[PDB]
PDB file of C-alpha atoms in Angstrom:
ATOM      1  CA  UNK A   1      32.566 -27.588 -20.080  1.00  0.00           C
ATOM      2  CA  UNK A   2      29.789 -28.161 -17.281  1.00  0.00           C
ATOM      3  CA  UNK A   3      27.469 -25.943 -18.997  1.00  0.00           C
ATOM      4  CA  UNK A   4      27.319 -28.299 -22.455  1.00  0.00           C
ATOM      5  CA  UNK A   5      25.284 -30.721 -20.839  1.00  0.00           C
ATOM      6  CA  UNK A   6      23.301 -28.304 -19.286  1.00  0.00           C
ATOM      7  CA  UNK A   7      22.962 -26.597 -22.957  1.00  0.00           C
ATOM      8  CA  UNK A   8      21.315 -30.348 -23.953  1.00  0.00           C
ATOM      9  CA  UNK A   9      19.357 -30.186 -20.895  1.00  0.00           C
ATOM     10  CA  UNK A  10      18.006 -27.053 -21.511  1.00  0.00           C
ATOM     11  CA  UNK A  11      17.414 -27.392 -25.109  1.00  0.00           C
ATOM     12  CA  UNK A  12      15.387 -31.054 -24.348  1.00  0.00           C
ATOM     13  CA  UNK A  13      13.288 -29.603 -21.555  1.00  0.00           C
ATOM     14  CA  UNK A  14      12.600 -26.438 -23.202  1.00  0.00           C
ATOM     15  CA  UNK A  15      11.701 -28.325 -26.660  1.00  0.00           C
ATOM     16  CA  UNK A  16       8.617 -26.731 -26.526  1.00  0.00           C
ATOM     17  CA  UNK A  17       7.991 -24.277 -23.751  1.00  0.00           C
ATOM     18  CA  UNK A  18       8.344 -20.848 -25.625  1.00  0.00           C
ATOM     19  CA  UNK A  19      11.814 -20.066 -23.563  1.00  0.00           C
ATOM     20  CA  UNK A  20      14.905 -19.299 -26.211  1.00  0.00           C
ATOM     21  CA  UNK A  21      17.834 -21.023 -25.369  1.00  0.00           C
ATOM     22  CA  UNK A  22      20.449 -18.704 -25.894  1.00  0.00           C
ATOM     23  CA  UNK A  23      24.166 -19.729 -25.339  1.00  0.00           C
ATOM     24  CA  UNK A  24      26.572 -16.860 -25.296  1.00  0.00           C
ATOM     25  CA  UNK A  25      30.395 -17.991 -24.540  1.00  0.00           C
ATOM     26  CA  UNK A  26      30.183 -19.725 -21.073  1.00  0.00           C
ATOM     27  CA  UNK A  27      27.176 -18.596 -19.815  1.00  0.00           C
ATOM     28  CA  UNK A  28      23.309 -19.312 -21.025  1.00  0.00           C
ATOM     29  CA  UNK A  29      21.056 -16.524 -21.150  1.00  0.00           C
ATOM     30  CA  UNK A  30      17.706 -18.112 -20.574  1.00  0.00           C
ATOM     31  CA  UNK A  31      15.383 -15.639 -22.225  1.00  0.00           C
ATOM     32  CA  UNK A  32      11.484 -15.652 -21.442  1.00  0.00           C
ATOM     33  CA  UNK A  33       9.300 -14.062 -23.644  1.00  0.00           C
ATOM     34  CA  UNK A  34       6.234 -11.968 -21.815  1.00  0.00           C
ATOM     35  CA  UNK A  35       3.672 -13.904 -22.996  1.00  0.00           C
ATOM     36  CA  UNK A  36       4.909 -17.202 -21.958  1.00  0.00           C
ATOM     37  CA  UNK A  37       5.996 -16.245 -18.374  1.00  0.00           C
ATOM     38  CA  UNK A  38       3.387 -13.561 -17.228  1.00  0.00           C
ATOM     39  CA  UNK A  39      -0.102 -13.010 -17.925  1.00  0.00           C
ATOM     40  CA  UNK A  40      -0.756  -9.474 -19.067  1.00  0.00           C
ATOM     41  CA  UNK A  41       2.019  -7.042 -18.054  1.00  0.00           C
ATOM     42  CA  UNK A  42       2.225  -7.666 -14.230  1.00  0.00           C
ATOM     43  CA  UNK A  43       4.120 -10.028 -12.680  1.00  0.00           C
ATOM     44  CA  UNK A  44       1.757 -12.865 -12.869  1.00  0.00           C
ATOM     45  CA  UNK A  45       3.153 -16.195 -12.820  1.00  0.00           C
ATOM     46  CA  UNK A  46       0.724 -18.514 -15.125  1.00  0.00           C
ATOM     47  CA  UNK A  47       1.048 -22.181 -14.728  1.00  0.00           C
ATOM     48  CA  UNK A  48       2.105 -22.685 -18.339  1.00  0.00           C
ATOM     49  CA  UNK A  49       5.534 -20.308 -16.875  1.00  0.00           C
ATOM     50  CA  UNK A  50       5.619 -21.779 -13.341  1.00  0.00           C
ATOM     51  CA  UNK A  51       5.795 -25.412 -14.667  1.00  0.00           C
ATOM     52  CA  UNK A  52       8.560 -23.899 -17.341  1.00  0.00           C
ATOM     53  CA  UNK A  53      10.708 -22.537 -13.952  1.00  0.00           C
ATOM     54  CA  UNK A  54      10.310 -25.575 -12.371  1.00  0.00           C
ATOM     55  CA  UNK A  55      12.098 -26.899 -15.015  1.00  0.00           C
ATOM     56  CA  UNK A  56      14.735 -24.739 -15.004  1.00  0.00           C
ATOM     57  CA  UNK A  57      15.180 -25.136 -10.974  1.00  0.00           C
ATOM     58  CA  UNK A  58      15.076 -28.491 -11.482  1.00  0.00           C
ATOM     59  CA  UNK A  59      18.354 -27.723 -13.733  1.00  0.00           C
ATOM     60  CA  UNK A  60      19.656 -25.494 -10.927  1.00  0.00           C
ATOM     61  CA  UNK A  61      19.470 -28.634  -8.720  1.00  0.00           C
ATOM     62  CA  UNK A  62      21.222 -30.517 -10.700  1.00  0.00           C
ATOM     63  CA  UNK A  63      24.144 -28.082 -11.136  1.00  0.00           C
ATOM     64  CA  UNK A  64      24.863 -26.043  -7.907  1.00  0.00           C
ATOM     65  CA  UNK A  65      27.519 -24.489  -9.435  1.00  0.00           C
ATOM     66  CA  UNK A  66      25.633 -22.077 -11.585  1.00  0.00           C
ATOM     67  CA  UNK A  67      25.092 -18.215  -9.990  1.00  0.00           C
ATOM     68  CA  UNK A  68      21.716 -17.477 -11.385  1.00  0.00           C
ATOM     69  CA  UNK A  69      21.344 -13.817 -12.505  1.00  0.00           C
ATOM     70  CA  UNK A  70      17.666 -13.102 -12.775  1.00  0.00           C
ATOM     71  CA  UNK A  71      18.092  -9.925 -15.244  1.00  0.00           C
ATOM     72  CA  UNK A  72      14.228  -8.265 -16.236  1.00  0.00           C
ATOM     73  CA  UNK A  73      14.756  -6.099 -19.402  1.00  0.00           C
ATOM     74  CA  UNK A  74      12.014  -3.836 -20.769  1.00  0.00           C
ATOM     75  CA  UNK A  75      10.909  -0.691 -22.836  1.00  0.00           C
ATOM     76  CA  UNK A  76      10.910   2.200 -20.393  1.00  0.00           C
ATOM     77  CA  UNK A  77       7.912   4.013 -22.610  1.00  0.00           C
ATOM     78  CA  UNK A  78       6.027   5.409 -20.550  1.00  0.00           C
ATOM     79  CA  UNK A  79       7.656   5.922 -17.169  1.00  0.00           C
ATOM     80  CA  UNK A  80      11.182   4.592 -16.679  1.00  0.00           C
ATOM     81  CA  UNK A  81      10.885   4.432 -12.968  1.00  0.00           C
ATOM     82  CA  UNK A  82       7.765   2.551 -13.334  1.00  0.00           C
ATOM     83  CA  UNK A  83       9.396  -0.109 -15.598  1.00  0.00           C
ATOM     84  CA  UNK A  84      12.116  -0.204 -13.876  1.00  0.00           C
ATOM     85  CA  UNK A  85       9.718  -1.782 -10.666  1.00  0.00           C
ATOM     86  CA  UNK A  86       8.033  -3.947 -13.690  1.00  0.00           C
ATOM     87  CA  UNK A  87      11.554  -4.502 -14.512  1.00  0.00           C
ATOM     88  CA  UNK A  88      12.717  -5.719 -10.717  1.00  0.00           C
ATOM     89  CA  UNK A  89       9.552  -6.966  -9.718  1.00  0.00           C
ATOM     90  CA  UNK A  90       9.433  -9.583 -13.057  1.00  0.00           C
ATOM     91  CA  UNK A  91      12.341 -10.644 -11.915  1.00  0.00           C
ATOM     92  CA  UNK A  92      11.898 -11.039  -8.240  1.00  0.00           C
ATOM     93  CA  UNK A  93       8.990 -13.077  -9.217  1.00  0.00           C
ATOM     94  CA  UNK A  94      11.099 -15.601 -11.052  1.00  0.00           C
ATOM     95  CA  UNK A  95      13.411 -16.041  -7.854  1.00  0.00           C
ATOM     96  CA  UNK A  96      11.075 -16.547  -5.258  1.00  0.00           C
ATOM     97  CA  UNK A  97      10.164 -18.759  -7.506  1.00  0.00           C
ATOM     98  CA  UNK A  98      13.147 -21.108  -7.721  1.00  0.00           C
ATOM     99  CA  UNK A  99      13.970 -20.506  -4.075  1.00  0.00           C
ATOM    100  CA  UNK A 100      10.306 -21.704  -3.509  1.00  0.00           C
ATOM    101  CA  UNK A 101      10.995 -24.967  -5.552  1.00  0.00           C
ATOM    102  CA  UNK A 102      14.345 -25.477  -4.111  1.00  0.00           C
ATOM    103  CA  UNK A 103      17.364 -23.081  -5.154  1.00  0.00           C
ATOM    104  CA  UNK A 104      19.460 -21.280  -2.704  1.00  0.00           C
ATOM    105  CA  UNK A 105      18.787 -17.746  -2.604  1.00  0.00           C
ATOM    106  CA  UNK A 106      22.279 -17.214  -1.749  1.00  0.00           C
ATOM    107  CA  UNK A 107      22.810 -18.165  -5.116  1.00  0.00           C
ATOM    108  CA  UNK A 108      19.891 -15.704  -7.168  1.00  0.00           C
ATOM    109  CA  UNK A 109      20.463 -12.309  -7.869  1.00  0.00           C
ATOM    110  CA  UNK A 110      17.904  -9.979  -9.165  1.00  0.00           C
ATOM    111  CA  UNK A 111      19.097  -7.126 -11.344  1.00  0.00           C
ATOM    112  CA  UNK A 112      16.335  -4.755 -12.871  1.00  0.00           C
ATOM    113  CA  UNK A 113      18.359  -3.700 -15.947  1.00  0.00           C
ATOM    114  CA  UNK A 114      14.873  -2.610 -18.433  1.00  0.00           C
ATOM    115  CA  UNK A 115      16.262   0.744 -19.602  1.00  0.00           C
ATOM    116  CA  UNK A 116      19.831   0.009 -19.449  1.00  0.00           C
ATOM    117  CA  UNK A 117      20.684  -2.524 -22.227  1.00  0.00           C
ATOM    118  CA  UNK A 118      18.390  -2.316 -25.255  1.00  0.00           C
ATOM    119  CA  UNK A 119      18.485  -5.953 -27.156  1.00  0.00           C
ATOM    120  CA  UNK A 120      16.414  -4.389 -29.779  1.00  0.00           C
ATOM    121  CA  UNK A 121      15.400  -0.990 -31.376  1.00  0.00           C
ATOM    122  CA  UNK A 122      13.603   1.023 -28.934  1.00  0.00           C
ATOM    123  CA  UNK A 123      11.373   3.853 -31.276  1.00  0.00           C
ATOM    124  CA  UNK A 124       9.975   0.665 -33.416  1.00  0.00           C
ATOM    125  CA  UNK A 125       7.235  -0.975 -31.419  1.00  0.00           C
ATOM    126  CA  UNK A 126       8.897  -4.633 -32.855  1.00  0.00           C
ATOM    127  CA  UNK A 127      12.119  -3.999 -31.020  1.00  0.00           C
ATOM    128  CA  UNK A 128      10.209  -2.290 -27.639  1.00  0.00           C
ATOM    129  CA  UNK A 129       8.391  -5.565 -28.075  1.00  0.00           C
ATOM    130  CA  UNK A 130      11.772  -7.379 -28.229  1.00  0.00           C
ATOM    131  CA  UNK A 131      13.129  -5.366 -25.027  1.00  0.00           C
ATOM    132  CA  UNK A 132      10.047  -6.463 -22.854  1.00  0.00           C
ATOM    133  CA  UNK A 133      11.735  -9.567 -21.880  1.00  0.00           C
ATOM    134  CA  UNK A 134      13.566 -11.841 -18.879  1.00  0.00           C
ATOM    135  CA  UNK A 135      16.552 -13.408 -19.392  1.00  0.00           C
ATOM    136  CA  UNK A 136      17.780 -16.025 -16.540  1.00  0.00           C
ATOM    137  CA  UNK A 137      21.878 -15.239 -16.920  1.00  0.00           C
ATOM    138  CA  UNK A 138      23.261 -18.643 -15.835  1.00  0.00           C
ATOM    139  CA  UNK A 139      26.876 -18.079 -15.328  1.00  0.00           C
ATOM    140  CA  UNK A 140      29.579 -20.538 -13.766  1.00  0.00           C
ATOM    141  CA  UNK A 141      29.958 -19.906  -9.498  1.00  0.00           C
ATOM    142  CA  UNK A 142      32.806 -16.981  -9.867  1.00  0.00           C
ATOM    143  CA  UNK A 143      34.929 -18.214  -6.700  1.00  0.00           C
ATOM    144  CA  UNK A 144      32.363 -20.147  -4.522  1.00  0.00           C
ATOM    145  CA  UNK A 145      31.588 -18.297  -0.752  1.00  0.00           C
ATOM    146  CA  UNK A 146      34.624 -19.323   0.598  1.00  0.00           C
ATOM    147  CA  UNK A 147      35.219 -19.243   4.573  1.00  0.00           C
ATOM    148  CA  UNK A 148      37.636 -21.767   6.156  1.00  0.00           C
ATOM    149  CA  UNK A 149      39.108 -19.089   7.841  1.00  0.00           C
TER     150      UNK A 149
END
Protein backbone atom coordinates (compact mmCIF):
# COMPACT_ATOMS: atom_id res chain seq x y z
CA UNK A 1 0.00 0.00 0.00
CA UNK A 2 1.18 3.70 0.88
CA UNK A 3 1.58 4.51 -2.64
CA UNK A 4 -2.46 3.88 -3.54
CA UNK A 5 -3.39 6.93 -1.98
CA UNK A 6 -0.70 8.68 -3.34
CA UNK A 7 -1.81 7.10 -6.91
CA UNK A 8 -5.42 9.11 -6.06
CA UNK A 9 -3.45 12.01 -5.08
CA UNK A 10 -1.58 12.17 -7.99
CA UNK A 11 -4.22 11.36 -10.40
CA UNK A 12 -6.64 14.37 -8.64
CA UNK A 13 -3.88 16.96 -8.66
CA UNK A 14 -2.60 16.12 -11.96
CA UNK A 15 -6.34 16.03 -13.49
CA UNK A 16 -5.27 18.40 -15.79
CA UNK A 17 -1.66 19.43 -15.75
CA UNK A 18 -0.25 17.51 -18.87
CA UNK A 19 1.93 15.06 -16.39
CA UNK A 20 1.02 11.09 -17.15
CA UNK A 21 0.47 9.27 -14.21
CA UNK A 22 2.07 6.17 -14.74
CA UNK A 23 1.93 3.36 -12.04
CA UNK A 24 4.30 0.53 -12.63
CA UNK A 25 4.22 -2.27 -9.68
CA UNK A 26 5.14 -0.28 -6.48
CA UNK A 27 6.59 2.59 -7.73
CA UNK A 28 4.98 5.71 -9.88
CA UNK A 29 6.85 6.95 -12.68
CA UNK A 30 5.78 10.54 -12.90
CA UNK A 31 6.41 11.32 -16.54
CA UNK A 32 6.62 15.07 -17.82
CA UNK A 33 6.24 15.73 -21.22
CA UNK A 34 8.79 18.63 -22.71
CA UNK A 35 6.37 20.92 -23.50
CA UNK A 36 4.64 21.07 -20.27
CA UNK A 37 7.77 21.28 -18.01
CA UNK A 38 10.36 23.36 -20.09
CA UNK A 39 10.07 26.03 -22.48
CA UNK A 40 11.96 25.26 -25.66
CA UNK A 41 14.66 22.59 -25.18
CA UNK A 42 16.68 24.07 -22.22
CA UNK A 43 16.04 23.61 -18.91
CA UNK A 44 13.59 26.34 -18.42
CA UNK A 45 11.21 25.97 -15.74
CA UNK A 46 7.78 27.79 -16.97
CA UNK A 47 5.28 28.59 -14.35
CA UNK A 48 2.63 26.36 -15.91
CA UNK A 49 5.63 23.31 -14.80
CA UNK A 50 6.82 25.00 -11.58
CA UNK A 51 3.22 25.24 -10.17
CA UNK A 52 2.83 21.36 -11.54
CA UNK A 53 6.22 20.45 -9.16
CA UNK A 54 4.91 22.19 -6.49
CA UNK A 55 2.32 19.91 -6.59
CA UNK A 56 4.16 17.03 -6.66
CA UNK A 57 6.50 18.33 -3.59
CA UNK A 58 3.63 19.07 -1.95
CA UNK A 59 2.99 15.09 -2.36
CA UNK A 60 6.59 14.48 -1.27
CA UNK A 61 5.63 16.31 1.96
CA UNK A 62 3.05 14.46 2.62
CA UNK A 63 4.82 11.09 2.22
CA UNK A 64 8.51 11.21 3.43
CA UNK A 65 8.89 7.87 2.73
CA UNK A 66 9.18 8.08 -1.00
CA UNK A 67 13.10 8.21 -2.53
CA UNK A 68 12.51 10.46 -5.45
CA UNK A 69 14.53 9.42 -8.55
CA UNK A 70 14.63 12.38 -10.86
CA UNK A 71 15.46 10.23 -14.18
CA UNK A 72 15.80 12.83 -17.61
CA UNK A 73 15.42 10.57 -20.73
CA UNK A 74 16.05 11.88 -24.26
CA UNK A 75 17.01 11.25 -28.00
CA UNK A 76 20.78 11.48 -28.15
CA UNK A 77 20.50 12.79 -32.08
CA UNK A 78 22.76 14.92 -32.45
CA UNK A 79 25.46 14.68 -29.80
CA UNK A 80 25.03 12.09 -27.05
CA UNK A 81 27.29 13.86 -24.68
CA UNK A 82 25.40 16.95 -25.23
CA UNK A 83 22.04 15.29 -24.35
CA UNK A 84 23.28 13.59 -21.91
CA UNK A 85 23.99 17.37 -19.98
CA UNK A 86 20.27 18.21 -21.42
CA UNK A 87 19.57 14.92 -20.00
CA UNK A 88 21.20 15.70 -16.25
CA UNK A 89 20.67 19.20 -16.32
CA UNK A 90 16.51 18.65 -16.97
CA UNK A 91 16.66 16.80 -14.24
CA UNK A 92 18.72 18.74 -11.82
CA UNK A 93 16.33 21.44 -12.57
CA UNK A 94 13.38 19.49 -11.27
CA UNK A 95 15.29 18.82 -7.86
CA UNK A 96 16.42 22.04 -6.94
CA UNK A 97 13.22 22.51 -7.49
CA UNK A 98 11.52 20.39 -4.84
CA UNK A 99 14.40 20.95 -2.45
CA UNK A 100 13.60 24.71 -3.05
CA UNK A 101 9.85 24.12 -2.10
CA UNK A 102 10.64 21.86 0.69
CA UNK A 103 12.00 18.17 -0.03
CA UNK A 104 15.10 16.83 1.45
CA UNK A 105 17.80 16.57 -0.93
CA UNK A 106 19.01 13.69 0.93
CA UNK A 107 16.14 12.13 -0.45
CA UNK A 108 16.46 13.28 -4.61
CA UNK A 109 18.62 11.64 -6.85
CA UNK A 110 19.36 12.80 -10.28
CA UNK A 111 20.19 10.17 -12.86
CA UNK A 112 20.79 11.41 -16.56
CA UNK A 113 19.74 8.14 -18.26
CA UNK A 114 18.70 9.96 -22.15
CA UNK A 115 20.58 7.43 -24.29
CA UNK A 116 20.38 4.52 -22.10
CA UNK A 117 16.73 3.31 -21.98
CA UNK A 118 14.75 4.09 -25.14
CA UNK A 119 10.77 4.18 -24.14
CA UNK A 120 10.10 4.58 -27.75
CA UNK A 121 11.57 3.99 -31.31
CA UNK A 122 14.54 6.03 -31.76
CA UNK A 123 15.01 6.36 -36.02
CA UNK A 124 11.10 7.56 -36.14
CA UNK A 125 10.96 11.18 -35.12
CA UNK A 126 7.38 10.07 -33.08
CA UNK A 127 9.28 7.79 -30.78
CA UNK A 128 12.63 10.38 -30.49
CA UNK A 129 9.73 12.64 -29.64
CA UNK A 130 8.51 10.05 -27.09
CA UNK A 131 12.21 9.60 -25.59
CA UNK A 132 12.56 13.46 -24.94
CA UNK A 133 10.97 13.14 -21.66
CA UNK A 134 11.33 13.28 -17.49
CA UNK A 135 10.02 10.83 -15.50
CA UNK A 136 9.98 11.53 -11.50
CA UNK A 137 10.63 7.56 -10.32
CA UNK A 138 8.85 7.63 -6.93
CA UNK A 139 9.87 4.49 -5.26
CA UNK A 140 9.22 3.34 -1.52
CA UNK A 141 12.50 4.53 1.06
CA UNK A 142 14.68 1.13 0.37
CA UNK A 143 15.95 0.81 4.16
CA UNK A 144 15.72 4.43 5.55
CA UNK A 145 19.51 6.13 6.53
CA UNK A 146 19.83 4.24 9.43
CA UNK A 147 22.51 5.26 12.25
CA UNK A 148 21.80 4.38 15.92
CA UNK A 149 25.03 3.07 16.08
Amino acid sequence: YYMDVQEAKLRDKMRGTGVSVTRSGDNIILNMPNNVTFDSSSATLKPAGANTLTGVAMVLKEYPKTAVNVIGYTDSTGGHDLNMRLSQQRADSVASALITQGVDASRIRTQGLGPANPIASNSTAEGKAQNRRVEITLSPLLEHHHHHH
